[PDB]
PDB file of C-alpha atoms and ligand atoms in Angstrom:
ATOM      1  CA  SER A   2     -21.754 -49.247  33.130  1.00 11.09           C
ATOM      2  CA  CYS A   3     -24.730 -51.332  32.022  1.00  9.92           C
ATOM      3  CA  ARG A   4     -25.854 -51.009  28.385  1.00 10.44           C
ATOM      4  CA  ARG A   5     -29.095 -51.330  26.442  1.00 10.36           C
ATOM      5  CA  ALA A   6     -27.855 -50.932  22.817  1.00 17.20           C
ATOM      6  CA  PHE A   7     -25.978 -53.814  21.156  1.00 17.07           C
ATOM      7  CA  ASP A   8     -24.935 -54.398  17.568  1.00 14.63           C
ATOM      8  CA  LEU A   9     -24.516 -58.134  16.813  1.00 15.24           C
ATOM      9  CA  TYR A  10     -22.379 -59.154  13.793  1.00 16.09           C
ATOM     10  CA  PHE A  11     -22.806 -62.819  12.744  1.00 12.33           C
ATOM     11  CA  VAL A  12     -19.721 -63.905  10.750  1.00 11.94           C
ATOM     12  CA  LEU A  13     -20.777 -67.171   9.180  1.00 10.99           C
ATOM     13  CA  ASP A  14     -18.569 -69.866   7.606  1.00  7.83           C
ATOM     14  CA  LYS A  15     -20.042 -71.136   4.315  1.00  6.90           C
ATOM     15  CA  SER A  16     -16.891 -72.970   3.231  1.00  7.93           C
ATOM     16  CA  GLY A  17     -17.033 -76.502   1.880  1.00  8.35           C
ATOM     17  CA  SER A  18     -15.901 -78.041   5.167  1.00  6.86           C
ATOM     18  CA  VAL A  19     -19.171 -76.977   6.895  1.00  7.36           C
ATOM     19  CA  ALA A  20     -21.572 -77.798   4.028  1.00  2.00           C
ATOM     20  CA  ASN A  21     -23.224 -80.762   5.779  1.00  2.18           C
ATOM     21  CA  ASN A  22     -23.819 -78.669   8.938  1.00  2.00           C
ATOM     22  CA  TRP A  23     -25.117 -75.410   7.449  1.00  3.77           C
ATOM     23  CA  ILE A  24     -28.509 -76.126   9.065  1.00  5.98           C
ATOM     24  CA  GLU A  25     -26.899 -75.931  12.543  1.00  6.79           C
ATOM     25  CA  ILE A  26     -25.381 -72.557  11.705  1.00  4.96           C
ATOM     26  CA  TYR A  27     -28.625 -71.175  10.315  1.00  7.00           C
ATOM     27  CA  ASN A  28     -30.628 -72.491  13.311  1.00  8.92           C
ATOM     28  CA  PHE A  29     -28.251 -70.820  15.787  1.00  7.64           C
ATOM     29  CA  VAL A  30     -28.561 -67.504  14.009  1.00  6.02           C
ATOM     30  CA  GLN A  31     -32.339 -67.732  13.753  1.00  6.29           C
ATOM     31  CA  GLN A  32     -32.633 -68.632  17.468  1.00  8.69           C
ATOM     32  CA  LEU A  33     -30.480 -65.703  18.643  1.00  5.66           C
ATOM     33  CA  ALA A  34     -32.351 -63.283  16.358  1.00  8.15           C
ATOM     34  CA  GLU A  35     -35.612 -64.618  17.802  1.00  8.42           C
ATOM     35  CA  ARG A  36     -34.356 -63.965  21.334  1.00  6.80           C
ATOM     36  CA  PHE A  37     -33.313 -60.357  20.700  1.00  3.09           C
ATOM     37  CA  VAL A  38     -36.053 -58.374  18.917  1.00  3.42           C
ATOM     38  CA  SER A  39     -35.616 -54.808  20.390  1.00  3.78           C
ATOM     39  CA  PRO A  40     -34.721 -52.078  17.859  1.00  4.88           C
ATOM     40  CA  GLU A  41     -31.780 -51.152  20.080  1.00  5.58           C
ATOM     41  CA  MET A  42     -30.584 -54.715  19.218  1.00  9.38           C
ATOM     42  CA  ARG A  43     -29.283 -54.370  15.630  1.00  4.48           C
ATOM     43  CA  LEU A  44     -28.171 -57.431  13.630  1.00  7.33           C
ATOM     44  CA  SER A  45     -25.847 -57.935  10.644  1.00  8.52           C
ATOM     45  CA  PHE A  46     -25.261 -61.226   8.736  1.00  8.57           C
ATOM     46  CA  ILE A  47     -21.914 -61.783   6.983  1.00  8.88           C
ATOM     47  CA  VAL A  48     -20.919 -64.927   5.096  1.00  9.67           C
ATOM     48  CA  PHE A  49     -17.451 -66.055   4.019  1.00  9.59           C
ATOM     49  CA  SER A  50     -15.724 -68.739   2.027  1.00  7.11           C
ATOM     50  CA  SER A  51     -13.184 -67.796  -0.695  1.00  8.44           C
ATOM     51  CA  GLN A  52     -14.764 -64.317  -0.623  1.00  5.89           C
ATOM     52  CA  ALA A  53     -16.966 -62.542   1.938  1.00  5.29           C
ATOM     53  CA  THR A  54     -20.254 -60.650   1.639  1.00  7.98           C
ATOM     54  CA  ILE A  55     -22.624 -58.665   3.823  1.00  8.32           C
ATOM     55  CA  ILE A  56     -25.955 -60.505   3.413  1.00  7.65           C
ATOM     56  CA  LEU A  57     -27.768 -58.288   5.945  1.00  8.90           C
ATOM     57  CA  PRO A  58     -26.276 -54.865   6.601  1.00 10.19           C
ATOM     58  CA  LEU A  59     -26.565 -53.824  10.261  1.00 11.03           C
ATOM     59  CA  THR A  60     -30.206 -53.071  11.060  1.00 11.51           C
ATOM     60  CA  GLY A  61     -32.963 -53.241  13.645  1.00  8.69           C
ATOM     61  CA  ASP A  62     -35.729 -53.528  11.053  1.00  7.46           C
ATOM     62  CA  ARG A  63     -37.275 -56.928  11.613  1.00  6.38           C
ATOM     63  CA  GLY A  64     -38.673 -57.159   8.047  1.00  5.89           C
ATOM     64  CA  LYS A  65     -35.128 -56.913   6.689  1.00  4.19           C
ATOM     65  CA  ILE A  66     -33.970 -59.377   9.369  1.00  2.00           C
ATOM     66  CA  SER A  67     -36.644 -61.829   8.259  1.00  2.00           C
ATOM     67  CA  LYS A  68     -35.422 -61.547   4.645  1.00  2.00           C
ATOM     68  CA  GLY A  69     -31.819 -61.853   5.781  1.00  2.00           C
ATOM     69  CA  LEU A  70     -32.756 -65.168   7.402  1.00  2.18           C
ATOM     70  CA  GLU A  71     -34.528 -66.304   4.196  1.00  2.06           C
ATOM     71  CA  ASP A  72     -31.303 -65.483   2.289  1.00  2.89           C
ATOM     72  CA  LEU A  73     -29.164 -67.377   4.814  1.00  2.00           C
ATOM     73  CA  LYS A  74     -31.468 -70.370   4.647  1.00  2.00           C
ATOM     74  CA  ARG A  75     -30.676 -70.850   0.916  1.00  2.00           C
ATOM     75  CA  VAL A  76     -26.877 -70.613   1.263  1.00  2.00           C
ATOM     76  CA  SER A  77     -24.901 -73.377  -0.434  1.00  2.00           C
ATOM     77  CA  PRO A  78     -21.495 -73.757   1.256  1.00  2.00           C
ATOM     78  CA  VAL A  79     -18.523 -74.430  -0.978  1.00  2.00           C
ATOM     79  CA  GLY A  80     -14.863 -73.437  -1.314  1.00  2.00           C
ATOM     80  CA  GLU A  81     -12.086 -72.237   0.935  1.00  2.00           C
ATOM     81  CA  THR A  82     -12.196 -70.639   4.407  1.00  2.00           C
ATOM     82  CA  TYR A  83     -11.083 -66.971   4.491  1.00  2.00           C
ATOM     83  CA  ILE A  84     -12.442 -66.057   7.927  1.00  2.00           C
ATOM     84  CA  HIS A  85     -10.258 -62.927   8.018  1.00  2.00           C
ATOM     85  CA  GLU A  86     -12.386 -61.483   5.169  1.00  2.00           C
ATOM     86  CA  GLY A  87     -15.613 -62.017   7.106  1.00  2.00           C
ATOM     87  CA  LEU A  88     -14.128 -60.435  10.263  1.00  3.26           C
ATOM     88  CA  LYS A  89     -12.950 -57.465   8.159  1.00  2.00           C
ATOM     89  CA  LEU A  90     -16.537 -56.777   6.943  1.00  2.00           C
ATOM     90  CA  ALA A  91     -17.722 -56.719  10.549  1.00  2.00           C
ATOM     91  CA  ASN A  92     -14.815 -54.352  11.427  1.00  2.00           C
ATOM     92  CA  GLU A  93     -15.657 -52.011   8.552  1.00  2.00           C
ATOM     93  CA  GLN A  94     -19.294 -51.675   9.723  1.00  2.00           C
ATOM     94  CA  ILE A  95     -18.195 -51.174  13.354  1.00  2.00           C
ATOM     95  CA  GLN A  96     -15.726 -48.425  12.309  1.00  2.00           C
ATOM     96  CA  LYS A  97     -18.541 -46.722  10.293  1.00  2.00           C
ATOM     97  CA  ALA A  98     -20.979 -46.955  13.213  1.00  2.00           C
ATOM     98  CA  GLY A  99     -18.585 -45.153  15.597  1.00  2.00           C
ATOM     99  CA  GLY A 100     -15.627 -47.482  16.336  1.00  2.00           C
ATOM    100  CA  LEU A 101     -14.890 -47.368  20.081  1.00  2.00           C
ATOM    101  CA  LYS A 102     -18.157 -45.378  20.632  1.00  2.00           C
ATOM    102  CA  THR A 103     -20.280 -48.411  19.688  1.00  2.00           C
ATOM    103  CA  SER A 104     -21.472 -51.473  21.615  1.00  2.00           C
ATOM    104  CA  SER A 105     -20.396 -54.264  19.265  1.00  2.00           C
ATOM    105  CA  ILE A 106     -20.376 -58.061  19.441  1.00  2.00           C
ATOM    106  CA  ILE A 107     -19.020 -60.412  16.776  1.00  2.00           C
ATOM    107  CA  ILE A 108     -20.145 -64.060  16.769  1.00  2.00           C
ATOM    108  CA  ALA A 109     -18.137 -66.276  14.402  1.00  2.00           C
ATOM    109  CA  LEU A 110     -19.733 -69.607  13.460  1.00  2.00           C
ATOM    110  CA  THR A 111     -17.036 -71.897  12.068  1.00  2.00           C
ATOM    111  CA  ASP A 112     -15.111 -75.138  12.409  1.00  2.00           C
ATOM    112  CA  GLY A 113     -11.950 -73.098  12.790  1.00  2.00           C
ATOM    113  CA  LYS A 114     -10.201 -75.320  10.241  1.00  2.00           C
ATOM    114  CA  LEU A 115      -7.851 -72.798   8.655  1.00  2.00           C
ATOM    115  CA  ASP A 116      -5.173 -73.236   5.988  1.00  2.00           C
ATOM    116  CA  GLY A 117      -1.820 -71.712   5.206  1.00  2.00           C
ATOM    117  CA  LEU A 118      -1.497 -68.084   6.270  1.00  2.00           C
ATOM    118  CA  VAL A 119      -5.182 -67.682   7.170  1.00  2.00           C
ATOM    119  CA  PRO A 120      -4.547 -68.167  10.921  1.00  2.00           C
ATOM    120  CA  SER A 121      -2.138 -65.188  10.729  1.00  2.00           C
ATOM    121  CA  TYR A 122      -4.691 -63.057   8.961  1.00  2.00           C
ATOM    122  CA  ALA A 123      -7.575 -64.125  11.200  1.00  2.00           C
ATOM    123  CA  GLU A 124      -5.740 -63.444  14.448  1.00  2.00           C
ATOM    124  CA  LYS A 125      -4.590 -60.049  13.206  1.00  2.00           C
ATOM    125  CA  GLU A 126      -8.152 -59.104  12.164  1.00  2.00           C
ATOM    126  CA  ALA A 127      -9.707 -60.269  15.452  1.00  2.00           C
ATOM    127  CA  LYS A 128      -7.118 -58.148  17.316  1.00  2.00           C
ATOM    128  CA  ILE A 129      -8.360 -55.202  15.189  1.00  2.00           C
ATOM    129  CA  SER A 130     -11.952 -56.016  16.275  1.00  2.00           C
ATOM    130  CA  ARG A 131     -10.905 -55.755  19.932  1.00  2.00           C
ATOM    131  CA  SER A 132      -9.031 -52.470  19.226  1.00  2.00           C
ATOM    132  CA  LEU A 133     -12.387 -51.074  17.974  1.00  2.00           C
ATOM    133  CA  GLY A 134     -13.962 -52.090  21.312  1.00  2.00           C
ATOM    134  CA  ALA A 135     -15.806 -55.146  20.000  1.00  2.00           C
ATOM    135  CA  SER A 136     -16.065 -58.443  21.791  1.00  2.00           C
ATOM    136  CA  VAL A 137     -15.507 -61.630  19.735  1.00  2.00           C
ATOM    137  CA  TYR A 138     -17.240 -64.954  20.407  1.00  2.00           C
ATOM    138  CA  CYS A 139     -16.757 -68.183  18.499  1.00  2.00           C
ATOM    139  CA  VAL A 140     -19.322 -70.955  18.109  1.00  2.00           C
ATOM    140  CA  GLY A 141     -17.728 -74.157  16.874  1.00  2.00           C
ATOM    141  CA  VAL A 142     -19.163 -76.472  14.229  1.00  2.00           C
ATOM    142  CA  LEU A 143     -18.286 -80.180  13.740  1.00  2.00           C
ATOM    143  CA  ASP A 144     -14.918 -81.334  15.133  1.00  2.00           C
ATOM    144  CA  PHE A 145     -13.804 -77.735  15.535  1.00  2.00           C
ATOM    145  CA  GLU A 146     -10.330 -76.443  16.265  1.00  2.00           C
ATOM    146  CA  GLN A 147     -10.656 -75.370  19.881  1.00  2.00           C
ATOM    147  CA  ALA A 148      -7.371 -73.560  20.274  1.00  2.00           C
ATOM    148  CA  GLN A 149      -7.737 -71.650  17.021  1.00  2.00           C
ATOM    149  CA  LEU A 150     -11.183 -70.463  18.142  1.00  2.00           C
ATOM    150  CA  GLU A 151      -9.823 -69.468  21.571  1.00  2.00           C
ATOM    151  CA  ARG A 152      -7.228 -67.265  19.894  1.00  2.00           C
ATOM    152  CA  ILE A 153      -9.813 -65.488  17.703  1.00  2.00           C
ATOM    153  CA  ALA A 154     -12.386 -65.029  20.499  1.00  2.00           C
ATOM    154  CA  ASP A 155     -11.645 -62.698  23.389  1.00  2.00           C
ATOM    155  CA  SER A 156     -10.800 -65.732  25.539  1.00  2.00           C
ATOM    156  CA  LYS A 157     -11.637 -69.395  26.013  1.00  2.00           C
ATOM    157  CA  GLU A 158     -14.765 -68.327  27.934  1.00  2.00           C
ATOM    158  CA  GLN A 159     -16.270 -66.929  24.706  1.00  2.00           C
ATOM    159  CA  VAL A 160     -15.950 -70.220  22.820  1.00  2.00           C
ATOM    160  CA  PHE A 161     -18.907 -72.672  22.703  1.00  2.00           C
ATOM    161  CA  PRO A 162     -19.897 -75.735  20.655  1.00  2.00           C
ATOM    162  CA  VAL A 163     -22.948 -75.168  18.426  1.00  2.00           C
ATOM    163  CA  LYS A 164     -24.095 -78.684  19.343  1.00  2.00           C
ATOM    164  CA  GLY A 165     -25.331 -79.859  22.702  1.00  2.00           C
ATOM    165  CA  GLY A 166     -27.132 -78.811  25.891  1.00  2.00           C
ATOM    166  CA  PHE A 167     -28.122 -75.324  24.634  1.00  2.00           C
ATOM    167  CA  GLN A 168     -24.636 -74.305  25.773  1.00  2.00           C
ATOM    168  CA  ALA A 169     -23.893 -71.752  23.070  1.00  2.00           C
ATOM    169  CA  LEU A 170     -27.307 -70.077  23.091  1.00  2.00           C
ATOM    170  CA  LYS A 171     -27.569 -69.922  26.890  1.00  2.00           C
ATOM    171  CA  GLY A 172     -23.949 -68.901  27.314  1.00  2.00           C
ATOM    172  CA  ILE A 173     -24.039 -66.075  24.819  1.00  2.00           C
ATOM    173  CA  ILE A 174     -27.489 -64.793  25.793  1.00  2.00           C
ATOM    174  CA  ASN A 175     -26.422 -64.828  29.460  1.00  2.00           C
ATOM    175  CA  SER A 176     -23.141 -63.044  28.583  1.00  2.00           C
ATOM    176  CA  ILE A 177     -25.084 -60.268  26.817  1.00  2.00           C
ATOM    177  CA  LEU A 178     -27.606 -59.957  29.670  1.00  2.00           C
ATOM    178  CA  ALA A 179     -24.729 -59.613  32.133  1.00  2.00           C
ATOM    179  CA  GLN A 180     -23.693 -56.471  30.228  1.00  2.00           C
ATOM    180  CA  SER A 181     -27.308 -55.179  30.096  1.00  2.00           C
ATOM    181  CA  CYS A 182     -29.324 -52.794  32.261  1.00  2.00           C
TER     182      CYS A 182
HETATM  183 MG1   MG B   1     -13.774 -74.611   5.843  1.00  2.00          MG
END
């Protein structure tokens, strides 16, 4: 059935590889927040590099969202790319909000450039997200790793470039509206 309540978890790469494009990431997040202002649309901001942190715990309070955006605007990307840790912080909040009883969307902003065993960890954690009933989208930055993002997202139709033709914003907004009453 159609839904009105969505919880949107932004899982944002602040590793060194994306440092020169942090503005694109921030702008995407600000634009999607701007689009969805209802209190039944709750947002959470998570950042990750060599460790992950919840910048904005899940909330519909727009004052807190404004401050969360101020905090994201000052981020200084550096270090390694442990995307699995960012996904796990989204999963922990989803589990605490109700698990399969929730209406949960994860949007990962990343170049998908993963090292060593991180692909293994990331794919396992995204499979956990889906087991909790969440849907995973990936928005690719720079010369992003398309296949890696397709594996993390629910499918290739939930992967978009952050650059060009308003593809990512339109595609994700229209995907959410399709699920909406
Ligand atoms: Mg990186």
